[PDB]
Fold this protein.
Amino acid sequence: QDLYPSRQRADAEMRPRLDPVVHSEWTNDAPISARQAAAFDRDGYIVLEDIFSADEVAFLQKAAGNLLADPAALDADTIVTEPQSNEIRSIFEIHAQSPVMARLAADARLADVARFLLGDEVYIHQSRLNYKPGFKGREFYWHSDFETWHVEDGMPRMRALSMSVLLAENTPHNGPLMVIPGSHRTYLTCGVPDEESLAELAHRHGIVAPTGKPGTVILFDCNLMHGSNGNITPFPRANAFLVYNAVSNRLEKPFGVEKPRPWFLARRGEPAALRVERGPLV
Amino acid sequence: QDLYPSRQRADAEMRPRLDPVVHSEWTNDAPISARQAAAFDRDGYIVLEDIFSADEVAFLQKAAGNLLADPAALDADTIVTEPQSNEIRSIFEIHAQSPVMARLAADARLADVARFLLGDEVYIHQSRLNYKPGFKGREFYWHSDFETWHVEDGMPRMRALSMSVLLAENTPHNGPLMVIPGSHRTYLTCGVPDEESLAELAHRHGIVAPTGKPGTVILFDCNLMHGSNGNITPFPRANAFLVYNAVSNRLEKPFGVEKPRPWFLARRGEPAALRVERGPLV
Ligand SMILES: CC1=N[C@H](C(=O)O)[C@@H](O)CN1
Ligand SMILES: CC1=N[C@H](C(=O)O)[C@@H](O)CN1
Ligand SMILES: O=C(O)CCC(=O)C(=O)O
Ligand SMILES: O=C(O)CCC(=O)C(=O)O
Ligand SMILES: [Fe+3]
Ligand SMILES: [Fe+3]
């Protein structure tokens, strides 16, 4: 029942992936092009530009701006500072609190791609606004999102993806998301990946740090190795994260101990199919 | 006496540069092109690529890893290590402690450009060899070299430049040095520059981060605002740092209190000129 055991041996292994990456047959009636599906297959991520209008983008940026400026109105449980601070690092369940964000996640232009790639109905496993403050923004060391979702939340299979919607401009200077392309086809066991292994992957695959204007979307497979550096620039980097999970891939018990995990980190346990909203955002 | 007062008020000022940036008239005798010289004037830095042969590059790389591997053989005060291990991170006065580095700093391809740009005979105010490992590389916040060299060392005029000779590859990803071009014409008073000022400079000049294969040289005016982000990548940062000061501009007493500063951070007091060296490094 555990296809992806981790944190059990005193060594790390590079286990082979035992799941599809794209879980659908591609055809003309798909939300992305055949080349785009093959890219995701091969690289474990793709980038979508100009899929929202500037009115849509502008509306979005204020939704995030407003949530991040009145943090006494939202669940105190769902706020992450840089602990020794009170500058915000993330805000969880933003699909659950902000209506604007809820409407975003349910939009066809995101969810249909999510359903095509996962070949199933989808639901939000998790959401976050990773506001990366200028001057004092701290990094996110390398990790496979799936390796925590699996051991800690009990996500059984590789059938999920993240969508990062950029709300500030991501230049190469304010700590954008870096990925190791192709790393999604290796399951690297551990709770933090080991330097020697990481070194092997990045050598084998190099590193990409996709940039883009606000409204650009980065979609990466749940098992892609990724991270980011800190941000000392005056430019904040606020990026909404949406984790789509296939409903077939509902959470069983955590394939580890410390079971279970806080409610906003991971949605348990019986999901309803997302209702896909076709339209703009006003 | 003091043209550049700093650390003497609770309010920082942005004061104007009262020195030239390029101290010489350009002709066809200059070791750089007229557009390069104009670019240094305007931007505060330029980048020389391919001035060293690959053999010469491999030679410097071999000598620097040698020096970094052998702390026994070097002055103990001029060493910096990691507060958890005995890994070297810096060696000061390498222009002194290493004959190779002493020959790099006297090479015409480097010293003649300083002599032109500074319009005087030069000498090493400070040299360094830096190894910044991957994975755990630390940030290094914004600051003008000249501000500390003025207040703490007694450098009286803006008549110095820094040369960073890349010994490992700097991609956009491994925390490469960042500069705010044009900020060398503004003297930001204070010993850390404040955020609002830094934001102002970055908003009006933007941020650039010169990358390059090893052997690439980055030259920058002493008062150019710079800094770097952290480095989680598996790719180390390594460089030879060389500060050329014009002999005309030798250190007086500090324009602050805490007089003075350790020998290996700033060469007092009546230095001789450097002797340029033409020819290969092997
Ligand atoms: C809940 C969550 N866990 C992973 C982690 O803890 O690194 C991350 O990849 C993202 N979100
Ligand atoms: C000793 C030295 N100090 C500056 C600094 O640490 O802020 C750097 O800009 C250059 N060299
Ligand atoms: O935005 C970041 O740099 C963190 C990305 C990440 O690993 C996540 O929380 O999904
Ligand atoms: O100190 C650092 O590492 C930032 C780069 C720099 O200013 C230097 O070391 O010369
Ligand atoms: Fe993540
Ligand atoms: Fe510096």
